[PDB]
Amino acid sequence: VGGGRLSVDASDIAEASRDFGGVARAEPMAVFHPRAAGDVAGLVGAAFRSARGFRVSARGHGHSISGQAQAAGGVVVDMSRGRARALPVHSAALGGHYVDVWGGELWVDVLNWTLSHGGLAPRSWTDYLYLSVGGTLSNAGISGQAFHHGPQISNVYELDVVTGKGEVVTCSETENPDLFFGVLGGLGQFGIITRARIALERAPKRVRWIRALYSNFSEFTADQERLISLGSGRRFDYVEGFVVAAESVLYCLEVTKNYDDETAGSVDQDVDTLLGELNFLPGTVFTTDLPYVDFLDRVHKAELKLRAKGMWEVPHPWLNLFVPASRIADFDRGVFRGVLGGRAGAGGPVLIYPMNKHKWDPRSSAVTPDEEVFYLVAFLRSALPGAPESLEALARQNQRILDFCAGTGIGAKQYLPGHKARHEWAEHFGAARWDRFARLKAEFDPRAILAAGQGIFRPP
Ligand SMILES: *Cc1cc2c(cc1C)nc1c(=O)[nH]c(=O)nc-1n2C[C@H](O)[C@H](O)[C@H](O)COP(=O)(O)OP(=O)(O)OC[C@H]1O[C@@H](n2cnc3c(N)ncnc32)[C@H](O)[C@@H]1O
Numbered sequence: 147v148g149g150g151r152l153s154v155d156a157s158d159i160a161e162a163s164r165d166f167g168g169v170a171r172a173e174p175m176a177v178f179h180p181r182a183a184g185d186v187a188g189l190v191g192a193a194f195r196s197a198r199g200f201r202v203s204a205r206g207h208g209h210s211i212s213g214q215a216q217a218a219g220g221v222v223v224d225m226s227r228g229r230a231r232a233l234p235v236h237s238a239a240l241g242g243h244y245v246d247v248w249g250g251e252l253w254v255d256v257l258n259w260t261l262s263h264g265g266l267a268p269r270s271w272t273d274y275l276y277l278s279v280g281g282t283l284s285n286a287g288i289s290g291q292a293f294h295h296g297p298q299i300s301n302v303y304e305l306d307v308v309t310g311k312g313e314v315v316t317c318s319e320t321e322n323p324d325l326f327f328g329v330l331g332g333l334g335q336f337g338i339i340t341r342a343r344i345a346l347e348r349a350p351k352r353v354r355w356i357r358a359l360y361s362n363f364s365e366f367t368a369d370q371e372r373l374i375s376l377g378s379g380r381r382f383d384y385v386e387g388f389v390v391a392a393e394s395v396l397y398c399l400e401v402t403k404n405y406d407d408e409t410a411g412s413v414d415q416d417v418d419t420l421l422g423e424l425n426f427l428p429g430t431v432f433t434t435d436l437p438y439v440d441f442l443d444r445v446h447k448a449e450l451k452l453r454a455k456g457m458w459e460v461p462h463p464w465l466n467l468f469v470p471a472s473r474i475a476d477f478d479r480g481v482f483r484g485v486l487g488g489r490a491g492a493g494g495p496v497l498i499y500p501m502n503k504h505k506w507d508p509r510s511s512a513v514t515p516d517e518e519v520f521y522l523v524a525f526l527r528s529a530l531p532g533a534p535e536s537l538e539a540l541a542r543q544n545q546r547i548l549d550f551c552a553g554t555g556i557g558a559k560q561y562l563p564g565h566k567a568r569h570e571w572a573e574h575f576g577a578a579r580w581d582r583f584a585r586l587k588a589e590f591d592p593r594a595i596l597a598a599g600q601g602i603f604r605p606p
């Protein structure tokens with residue numbers, strides 16, 4: 147336990163009993179507030195040595211949908227609560243800068259820290275910055291930059307991990323690689339990340355942010371696929387998209403072009419040349435020019451508007467799927483024009499954009515479809531508050547989408563999976579990856595103390 151403290155404070159318990167999903171409510175016995183990595187090791191070590199064992203889960207910002215950060219009758223480690231920060235460091239071997247961050251650090255605070263110490267910033271993002279480093283690294287961490295730099299799990303040099311035996315282990319591609327690759331995308335199963343060594347680049351100053359409309363899905367996806375194949379060279383720095391509710395279906399392409407004081411003179415010509423090659427509906431180009439930080443933090447501004455309208459602290463029955471590019475047209479037909487019938491019926495934004503599998507290390511625990519180009523399709527649903535029928539309808543719509551994928555053999559894979567059924571986890575991973583996942587579990591968390599809320603292994 148060391149410098150850290152155990153808390154049975156009512157508000158601490160209440161927060162550790164809830165997440166962004168707003169449904170799962172498993173209460174821990176206590177909330178642990180560590181001062182350092184050693185405190186986390188002491189607590190996990192005490193759980194591993196105890197006769198009965200007890201559940202231990204790290205909580206980042208509690209952005210999980212289905213109780214993944216919850217520890218029923220156990221201890222929730224509040225990693226993100228404020229508790230010495232390492233400055234960025236340049237390596238001539240890596241050919242750039244890295245920075246060591248506490249595992250519970252929010253990406254927003256990492257960004258503010260790196261910009262203030264050399265105008266540096268991480269290369270790979272999430273659309274929302276109030277997420278912990280350990281939380282997104284336990285999943286993948288994706289946004290519109292992932293097609294080029296890969297997800298956040300492809301932009302980490304090293305980790306310190308407290309295993310399910312309470313041992314502090316430093317790992318990287320060349321040091322304890324099984325733990326390193328096991329933890330990256332590992333759903334908190336093999337240890338708690340107390341340190342992550344993040345790749346950095348010189349941050350641009352400004353962003354040209356563009357949106358354009360399409361009515362033809364083949365032309366929309368052909369343009370997204372062409373844009374993500376660039377830069378192997380003139381390209382957009384971010385590529386996303388979303389399905390537009392008409393109240394015939396519309397699609398919106400979202401791209402950006404980053405610039406600084408030096409490149410400001412070529413930005414307008416670069417954007418025009420890239421747009422001139424696209425097939426969006428004429429006269430539907432919407433442009434904004436804004437500082438880099440303001441673009442990165444755009445989702446937080448939307449959050450503030452939702453909180454003011456009492457539309458933030460509502461159930462969020464999200465569904466995030468990775469769909470192979472070869473079946474994206476069938477998905478659009480079956481889901482966007484079928485299950486949804488072209489209708490707001492989704493209960494929130496429906497994001498759609500492709501990524502390149504080659505930017506994803508095949509050794510990590512992350513599960514992607516068995517194809518080079520795949521899409522993220524994100525149903526970012528909000529149920530109406532006080533309306534149980536709203537959550538029932540959206541949960542049923544998620545089940546139909548999964549049933550349509552399984553029924554038509556679309557090799558889709560859930561991102562942030564909420565399976566909680568043995569044969570379904572085995573189907574999610576596939577034979578070879580499941581055997582490796584189970585073997586890593588026997589090695590690093592044999593008692594299944596960690597991240598029991600994921601519902602993969604039988605916990606104490
Ligand atoms: C709420 C939300 C989530 C979100 C998003 C926008 C919002 C409003 N935008 C995302 C995006 O653009 N791209 C992306 O990849 N994910 C996005 N998300 C989802 C988000 O990544 C996940 O919710 C993720 O879980 C991170 O959120 P958070 O940091 O709050 O973590 P958590 O929910 O508490 O715990 C998640 C799991 O990881 C384990 N855990 C937590 N910290 C650690 C450490 N340090 N080491 C190891 N495991 C850890 C938890 O126990 C849990 O299983």
Ligand SMILES: O=C(Nc1cnns1)Nc1ccccc1CCO
Pocket residue numbers: 273274288289290445448466495497522524526561562
């Ligand atoms: O939640 C968002 N983006 C938001 C925009 N406005 N409110 S949320 N993304 C997300 C959420 C969960 C998983 C993956 C993703 C990445 C999609 O790029």
